[PDB]
Amino acid sequence: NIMSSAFYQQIQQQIEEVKAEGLYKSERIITSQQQAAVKIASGEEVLNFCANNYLGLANHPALIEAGKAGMDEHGFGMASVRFICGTQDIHKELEQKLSTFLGKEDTILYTSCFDANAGLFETILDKEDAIISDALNHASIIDGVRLCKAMRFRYSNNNMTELEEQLIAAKDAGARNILIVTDGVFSMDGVVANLPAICDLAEKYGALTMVDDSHAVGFMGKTGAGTHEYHDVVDRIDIITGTLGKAMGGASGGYTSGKKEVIEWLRQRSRPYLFSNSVAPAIVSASIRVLDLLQESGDLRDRLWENATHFRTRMSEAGFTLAGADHAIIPIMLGDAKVAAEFAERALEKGIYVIGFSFPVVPKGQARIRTQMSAAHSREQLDKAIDAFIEVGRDMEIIK
Amino acid sequence: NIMSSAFYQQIQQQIEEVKAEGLYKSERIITSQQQAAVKIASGEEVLNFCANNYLGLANHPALIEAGKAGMDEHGFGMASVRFICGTQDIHKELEQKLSTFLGKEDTILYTSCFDANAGLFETILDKEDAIISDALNHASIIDGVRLCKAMRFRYSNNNMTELEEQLIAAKDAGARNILIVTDGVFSMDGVVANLPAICDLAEKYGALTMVDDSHAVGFMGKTGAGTHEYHDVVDRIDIITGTLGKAMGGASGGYTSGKKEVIEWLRQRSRPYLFSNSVAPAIVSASIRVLDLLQESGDLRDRLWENATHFRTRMSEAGFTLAGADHAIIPIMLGDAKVAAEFAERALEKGIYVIGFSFPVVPKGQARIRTQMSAAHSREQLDKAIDAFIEVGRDMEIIK
C-alpha cells in the first residue's frame, strides 16, 4: 500500500537477524515419496533420519489402496463441518476403532493434533479450575492452555517434587478441578514421562490426567496403544490426545479420547470442531486400515526396536553421548550449536539427512542432533548411516 | 474414581442445560458421497442445501483420479513438518499456483484455515501494533487475535464510520502498525464486505488490510480469485487468508497469501506451520488439479450463479424475505427461533436438508435458515426444493 514499505522493511530486518543468529529454517525440496531413501532436488538419494515415519507407513501400499478406496466410496471431501453435513459413517467407524484401540469410551476427530489440543482446555476448564503442565510440553499444548482461563502452574521436567508442590499450591488457590497435562514422550530428549508417579500423585490429590501420545501411539506398549499401555496405567489416565501424522500413517488428523461426557461436551463446544472442515474420507479410511494392519502383525514394531537397540549400542560404543531411553527417538548430544550445524552439514555430505537443534528449542549448551529410528530402515542402511556418523565424529575431533 | 465422577457429572449438567435451551448439536450420519443427493442412515435421499460445495468439486471425478495419482507418485503422508523433511515439490508448486491465482507474491500452506488465522497475528504484530476487527469476524480470526498482544479494536458490521473512528483512535493511541481484519463474505448474511471503502480508509490512515476469502475463493470474481477481484482491489489488500475446504474441493487445508517477506517470516515463526504436520500429497495434487480445472472452464461458476438467480427470484416472488446480495449464500429470514426450527424439521420431511440459526450466532429475533447454492444442483432438484420450501411456507402460515 503506502506505509507498507516501512512494515515489510521491519520484517526483512527481522529475517536478516534470524540469518545472522544462525536460526534460519530452510526447506529442502523432496521429489520422492516419504520412505527410508529420499531423493532431493539436487538428484542425490539420502537416508532419512529426521522423519516421524516410525513404522514406515507413509508409503505403505495397503494405506494407499485404502485411501483410493475411500476416495471412490465416500468422495474426496466433505465441504462442511461435522454437525452440519460433514459426518460420514467412516468417521464414527474410525472413532469407535480408536476408542477400542486406546481403551477409552469415546474419541473425537480433528484435522490435526494441534487443533485437538487447542480446542480442549478452554472447552472444559473455567476460571475456578487449574492446569498443571510439564515445563517441556509441546507448543500446541501451550497455546491451548493460553486459550484457557484456568489457573496456570508449571513444573520442571520430570520433577515429581515440583509437581507435588504445584498441586499443593493449586489446592491452596481454591481450584475446583485440577488437570495435569503431559507429553507421553518428550520429543527432544527421547524420554518417556513418569506416568506411574503422576497417576499416584493424581489419586493422592484428586486430579485428572491428560497425556499427549503423539510420538507414542502405534508402537509404544504391547499392542502399541501408547505410553499409557507402556506403564500399564490405562483407566488411570483420563484424557488422551494424539495424531495420525506420526507412526499411524503420516498424513494428518488428530484425536481426543476419554469418557463420553467429555467427548459430547467437545462435540458441542470445541471451537476447532465447530468451525473447521471435517476430516477427509481418504485419511479416515487409511487410518481404519492402519488400525487393522497394526492388529495383524507386530513385525514392524520388532524391526523398529531392533533398529533402535542396534543404533544405540553401536553409537554408544564409538564414544557418542546419547540421551533418552526405550524409545525410537535417539538424540546425539553435541553441546555447542555450531558443532551441531556442522555435524548436520557433514552428515548430509555423506548422504545422511539429520537435523540439529539449539537454543530456543533446547537449553544451551545442550545442543543435539535428534535421530529418529524407523521400521523402514534395514541394517544395510542403518550400518551405512552409523558408519557415516562415526566418520563425521572423527573428522570433527569429537570422538577419538 | 471419585473426583473423575464429580467432574463428568458437572459436564453432564452442562450438556443437559444445552439440551434444555434447544441448542444440542446432533450429527446426522451420511452413507453416500458429498453431492446434491445425500443418503442418510434412514435410507432417505435428501437434497443438500447447507454444504459449502459451491462448485460441486467434493465428488468431482477429476479430483478423485488426481488424488489417486498424487498418492501413487508422492505417497500417502509426509510424517514431518515442512522445515524438517515435509516439503515436497508439489507443495511449492501449489504455493506458486495459488499465489498467481490470487494475484499475490507468495503463499504458505496449513492443514486448515483455522491454523492459518491462528498463526498470523501473533507472528506479525507486537504490542506496539493494533488490530481493528469487524464485530462479525469468524471464530478462527477471533482466536488468532486472542493470541496477539496488539491493541484490539472493533467496529460494528459494515459500519465504515465506526471503522474510521477506530482508525483515528488507533492513530491517537500511538499504534506502530495497524491491521484491519475482515471476512470477504459474512457467512450468516450472504453479504460481501465493503472492501473499497475499507481500502480507501486504510490508504487515508496508512493501515494494512487482511481479508478472509474462505467463502469467496473459487467463484467470487471474474476468475474466481475472491472478493478482492469482485471489487477490483488487488494490490490494495495486503494479506489474504483462505481455505480449500469450500469451493476449492472440500477436503482440508488452508493458506495465507501476501508479499514474500511476510510469507518468509511466517515460515520462520508461525507456530502452526512449525509444529503441525505438512499437507498430505493427495490434497495438494487435487488442489493443483482444482486450479487447472478452474482455469479450463467457467461452466461451474455459470451454473452456480444461474441457480442463485433462479432461487432468489422464485423465492422473492413467493413472499419470502431473503437477505444477502451477489453470493451463493441465500438466507431465508424467518424471525422467530421456533419458526426456524420447525421450518428445518418440515423441510427435512419434504426431503430437503437445511439448517437454521438463532440467537447465539445471529441476533434475535433475526432467526434465519442459511441456504447455500451449489453447482451440483440441477433445476430439477432446485425446483423440487423451491416447491418444498413454498409448501412449508404455506403450511406454517408464513407466506400467503
Can you characterise this structure?
Chains A, B: Catalyzes the cleavage of 2-amino-3-ketobutyrate to glycine and acetyl-CoA. Chains A, B: Homodimer. Chains A, B: This is 2-amino-3-ketobutyrate coenzyme A ligase. Chains A, B: One of its GO terms (cellular component) is cytosol. Chain A has a domain at about 60-295: Type I PLP-dependent aspartate aminotransferase-like (Major domain) (Aspartate Aminotransferase, domain 2). Chain A has 16 helices and 15 strands. Chain A has helices at about 5-20, 60-75, 80-85, 90-100, 115-120, 120-125, 140-145, 160-170, 195-205, 225-230, 260-270, 270-275, 280-295, 300-315, 335-350, 380-395, and strands at about 35-40, 45-50, 105-110, 130-135, 150-155, 180-185, 185, 190, 210, 240-245, 255-260, 330-335, 350-355, 355, 365-370. In chain A, strand 7 and strand 8 form a beta hairpin. The interface between A and B is large, with 104 and 105 residues.
Which terms would index this structure?
homodimer; Aspartate Aminotransferase, domain 2; 7-stranded mixed beta sheet; 3-stranded mixed beta sheet; 15 strands; 44% helix
Number of helices, where a helix is a run of at least 4 consecutive DSSP H or I residues of chain A: 16
Specify the biggest β-sheet of chain A.
Answer: 7 strands, mixed
CATH architecture annotation of the domain at 61-295 in chain A:
3-Layer(aba) Sandwich
Report the helical percentage of chain A.
40-55%
Please state how the strands of the largest beta sheet of chain A are arranged side by side.
Answer: 3-11-10-9-6-4-5
Count of individual beta strands of chain A: 15
Q: What pair of chains forms the biggest interface?
A: A-B, 104 and 105 residues
Q: Please write the CATH class name of the domain at 61-295 in chain A.
A: Alpha Beta
PDB class: transferase
Keywords: acyltransferase, sphingolipids, transferase
Assembly: dimeric
Entry title: Structural insights into the substrate selectivity of acyl-CoA transferase
